[PDB]
Design a protein around this ligand. Sequence first.
Ligand SMILES: OC[C@@H]1O[C@@H](O[C@@H]2[C@@H](O)[C@H](O[C@@H]3CO[C@@H](O)[C@H](O)[C@H]3O)OC[C@H]2O[C@@H]2OC[C@@H](O)[C@H](O)[C@H]2O)[C@H](O)[C@H]1O
Ligand SMILES: OC[C@@H]1O[C@@H](O[C@@H]2[C@@H](O)[C@H](O[C@@H]3CO[C@@H](O)[C@H](O)[C@H]3O)OC[C@H]2O[C@@H]2OC[C@@H](O)[C@H](O)[C@H]2O)[C@H](O)[C@H]1O
Ligand SMILES: OC[C@@H]1O[C@@H](O[C@@H]2[C@@H](O)[C@H](O[C@@H]3CO[C@@H](O)[C@H](O)[C@H]3O)OC[C@H]2O[C@@H]2OC[C@@H](O)[C@H](O)[C@H]2O)[C@H](O)[C@H]1O
Ligand SMILES: O[C@@H]1[C@@H](O)[C@H](O[C@@H]2CO[C@@H](O[C@@H]3CO[C@@H](O)[C@H](O)[C@H]3O)[C@H](O)[C@H]2O)OC[C@H]1O
Ligand SMILES: O[C@@H]1[C@@H](O)[C@H](O[C@@H]2CO[C@@H](O)[C@H](O)[C@H]2O)OC[C@H]1O
Ligand SMILES: O[C@@H]1[C@@H](O)[C@H](O[C@@H]2CO[C@@H](O)[C@H](O)[C@H]2O)OC[C@H]1O
Ligand SMILES: O[C@@H]1[C@@H](O)[C@H](O[C@@H]2CO[C@@H](O)[C@H](O)[C@H]2O)OC[C@H]1O
Ligand SMILES: O[C@@H]1[C@@H](O)[C@H](O)OC[C@H]1O
Lengths: 436, 436
Amino acid sequence: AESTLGAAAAQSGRYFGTAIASGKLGDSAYTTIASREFNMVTAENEMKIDATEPQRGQFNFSAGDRVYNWAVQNGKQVRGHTLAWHSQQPGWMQSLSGSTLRQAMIDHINGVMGHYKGKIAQWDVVNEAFSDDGSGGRRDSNLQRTGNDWIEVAFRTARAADPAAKLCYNDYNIENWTWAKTQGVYNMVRDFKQRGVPIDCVGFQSHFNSGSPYNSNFRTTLQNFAALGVDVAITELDIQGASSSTYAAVTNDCLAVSRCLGITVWGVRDTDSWRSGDTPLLFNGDGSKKAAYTAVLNALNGGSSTPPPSGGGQIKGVGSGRCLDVPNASTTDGTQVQLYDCHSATNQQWTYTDAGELRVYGDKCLDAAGTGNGTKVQIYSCWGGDNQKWRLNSDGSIVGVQSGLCLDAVGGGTANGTLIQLYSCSNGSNQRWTRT
Amino acid sequence: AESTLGAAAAQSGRYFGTAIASGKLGDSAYTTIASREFNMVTAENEMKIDATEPQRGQFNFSAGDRVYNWAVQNGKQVRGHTLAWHSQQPGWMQSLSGSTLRQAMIDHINGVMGHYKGKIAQWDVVNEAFSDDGSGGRRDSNLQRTGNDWIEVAFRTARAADPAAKLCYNDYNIENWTWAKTQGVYNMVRDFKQRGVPIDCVGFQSHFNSGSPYNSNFRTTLQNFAALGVDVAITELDIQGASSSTYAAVTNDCLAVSRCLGITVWGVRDTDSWRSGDTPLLFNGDGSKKAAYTAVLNALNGGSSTPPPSGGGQIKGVGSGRCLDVPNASTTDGTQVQLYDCHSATNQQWTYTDAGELRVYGDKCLDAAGTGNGTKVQIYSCWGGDNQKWRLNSDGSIVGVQSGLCLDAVGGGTANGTLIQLYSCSNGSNQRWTRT
Ligand SMILES: OC[C@@H]1O[C@@H](O[C@@H]2[C@@H](O)[C@H](O[C@@H]3CO[C@@H](O)[C@H](O)[C@H]3O)OC[C@H]2O[C@@H]2OC[C@@H](O)[C@H](O)[C@H]2O)[C@H](O)[C@H]1O
Ligand SMILES: OC[C@@H]1O[C@@H](O[C@@H]2[C@@H](O)[C@H](O[C@@H]3CO[C@@H](O)[C@H](O)[C@H]3O)OC[C@H]2O[C@@H]2OC[C@@H](O)[C@H](O)[C@H]2O)[C@H](O)[C@H]1O
Ligand SMILES: OC[C@@H]1O[C@@H](O[C@@H]2[C@@H](O)[C@H](O[C@@H]3CO[C@@H](O)[C@H](O)[C@H]3O)OC[C@H]2O[C@@H]2OC[C@@H](O)[C@H](O)[C@H]2O)[C@H](O)[C@H]1O
Ligand SMILES: O[C@@H]1[C@@H](O)[C@H](O[C@@H]2CO[C@@H](O[C@@H]3CO[C@@H](O)[C@H](O)[C@H]3O)[C@H](O)[C@H]2O)OC[C@H]1O
Ligand SMILES: O[C@@H]1[C@@H](O)[C@H](O[C@@H]2CO[C@@H](O)[C@H](O)[C@H]2O)OC[C@H]1O
Ligand SMILES: O[C@@H]1[C@@H](O)[C@H](O[C@@H]2CO[C@@H](O)[C@H](O)[C@H]2O)OC[C@H]1O
Ligand SMILES: O[C@@H]1[C@@H](O)[C@H](O[C@@H]2CO[C@@H](O)[C@H](O)[C@H]2O)OC[C@H]1O
Ligand SMILES: O[C@@H]1[C@@H](O)[C@H](O)OC[C@H]1O
């Protein structure tokens, strides 16, 4: 099993990317993670219209090239984002309408694609052209007001500018098949392929939250578009709350569709997210891997032979044969856990939540009051701290999100009463656990 | 007399205060909460040694008076903090020692107490004089090196300076009766009382976290000190994770001790906390009341006519007589909840967690998809968002922490299938619920 997201995705011929902010490239913590985990890069803002053509006819690639150079220097391919869009247009373009705007859109596409000709894997040629009003029609923007054919023209222009690039139509809230927006986009792409309009891919931003949640029918949405003869890609994935299950579900949906090129999450650490308040990414502020990170990696690697114990379940250490147990079924916060002969008792029934907690009694959480070796593993009221979050590695070890240390049976102890602590992972049998 | 913390505490002759920072008195969001909820104030830093005597012999009460004046002008008593302490001493005092330091200690006490003579309810004369090494002995500081009798001298000095003030000894990690530190202080206070050393109160900072967790024996500690003939006060309360149950437990501990003067939480909003990372207070950064706030208010008002449920239970609407139900026992995120004839089934069994969540199926959370009127209430993977946190008001309403809006049966419907939404609280029967 591969150890990084990019490498794991490549095992299925896919990529796993992120959105890079040029202003954060001087941050070693940021680049260490980004260079290691991803093999595809999208500039978060540097290749947008206002950034690449500040004045009409005057192109500027200083910001975009800093991102591009970093990507190629670190072995990543690049998704160009984005050529024609109603948002983040420079002031001079916002002032345009009709034929003048139409030609400006064309000139912009030619200028930017010409600069990056042959260096971009995919280009989001058109971004967010459909409305959210439920009509399934076009968003009202200066671009749409130039004529309904503006999208078609953008794609024909892009194809000629750089025939080596895959041309994508990108949008959000088009993941759930039942939505009118989703179906409006489907009809357009269908029409395009039918009439020979140059379009190679459809990007599903995949910005999921309780307002617009992930729905399992997303797999059918992907299959439907793939059937039109276009590749599909998850382009700006982030999930409010970062549910391990939801992240895994999305990953498996892409892996179930042969035409799904890969997944790009919209940012590196939650603190780098445009929606940091929703802690929707795979790494938290201090750069530690979140529970969702392990869920995605495991999914990319094919998953587990047997599905995780839905609710409840004992945690037995292979090196001892005993189960993680709370001393005398105590519910007092601060009680250090231990190993003990497995048996039908709530003080041995742990539930691994989507947030990455190991709950017992329903509202008590496996807790670590420190981050250094020797830190006692205990129980404490659940509140969501990173010191109460854990990652279930495929090798059977359980790692604390905040500390990055593995659950360890003090002194390789295997007898009953053996306390549990945090310690540098070592593949030891006293650090391996079975979800029996 | 019971809609705010201070007023509710006043019903039993107690107070509920906070720590004020004068630099925030210009922030309307801050003062709106502080002036309304508390009737006792402690200066977070403005009455400390360095802030009151910047240079030896040169007192400056500018900052301290700003806090004091705001307090009295807004109807709050004041706790003076703190006269003799090893920490936050001005540079000049840190380098002092021996009899030189002793005289300075006395001069400081006289200068500060003299300035506020007759205006202060309680004074933390001495702060944190005991060690955490587990020996139960004194902390090694320049103050202790001047003679083990510095504490006694400090109190005798204080008494003379202002006999109308209650003199308290303040410290942390002295809440758990089984700790050596707690015993050391207990024995000292007992000795002081027997020898006539003028001490009127013992302040328990109450900074609880998984490192030094709250324990039910805190009540015993309070009762043991009360039995010595001294008042007790919870002076700097904050709880890592802000568990609703732990906050209510501490509140009830004070109410259980006749000598417990009141409770002070160390700050207003979590963002104002010295430990914001532990989100240990009663209000969020945006100023919204947390689950714990309602738990404290309810405890102060005498709790409920019946002991709060122990997880897993139905939530029945008063107006409809029907239960909060997840349509067809679905577990898909985004499924809006409804009313339905009550029956024994997991899709009607909700657990109120200490974090303020209403969980179903174990890892699904009652979730608000927005903050305005008409916002859909559904289930979504639990992740800790404020839109998944709720307050169980004494009048039977359930208020969303983030929105400040009430769970509401759409259109006042009462029939099976009536959907649930958020809406301005109105005291309507379609917004009232019983968990019994
Ligand atoms: O707000 C700070 C800014 O947040 C991040 O930059 C965001 C982008 O992430 C955002 O991406 C779009 C998200 O919606 C998708 O549908 C769309 O396809 C994406 O392109 O776009 C807005 C951008 O904010 C601007 O960034 C540039 C800055 O000068 C502007 O003031 C911001 O409003 C970055 O993390 C951070 O810079
Ligand atoms: O700048 C951070 C500062 O944090 C908060 O101020 C804290 C006080 O809350 C803290 O109170 C003590 C906590 O421990 C108790 O045992 C003791 O009794 C309390 O008095 O004391 C430290 C103080 O920090 C200093 O504040 C002033 C600043 O100039 C210093 O650099 C800080 O170290 C406030 O929320 C915030 O201002
Ligand atoms: O009885 C007719 C019904 O009630 C009215 O709508 C009420 C509002 O008047 C009410 O206003 C709040 C009253 O308490 C104040 O403290 C608060 O500041 C006011 O905002 O809020 C509730 C609302 O009822 C909801 O209306 C929408 C419906 O879908 C919900 O089910 C109702 O609970 C109107 O006459 C009608 O709604
Ligand atoms: O999501 C809804 C389901 O929860 C709902 O379940 C039915 C609830 O009522 C059950 O019958 C009750 C048994 O107890 C008696 O006291 C009541 O009067 C009966 O109504 C019924 O067996 C359940 O299937 O069904 C509808 C779903 O939308
Ligand atoms: O910029 C775009 C946002 O405007 C968009 O907002 C969505 C609107 O519909 C709601 O149901 C969704 O919850 C909300 O996120 O999201 C995508 C983003 O690119
Ligand atoms: O206090 C001692 C612990 O620090 C010690 O920890 C062990 C260190 O080596 C690791 O390989 C072991 O897994 C870990 O338990 O154990 C003995 C105890 O007395
Ligand atoms: O300033 C004081 C802190 O130094 C003190 O720190 C405590 C040390 O013991 C640990 O077990 C606790 O978790 C930790 O908070 O806390 C009180 C504070 O006033
Ligand atoms: O926690 C242990 C309990 O599970 C077992 O049954 O008896 C011994 C205890 O220490």
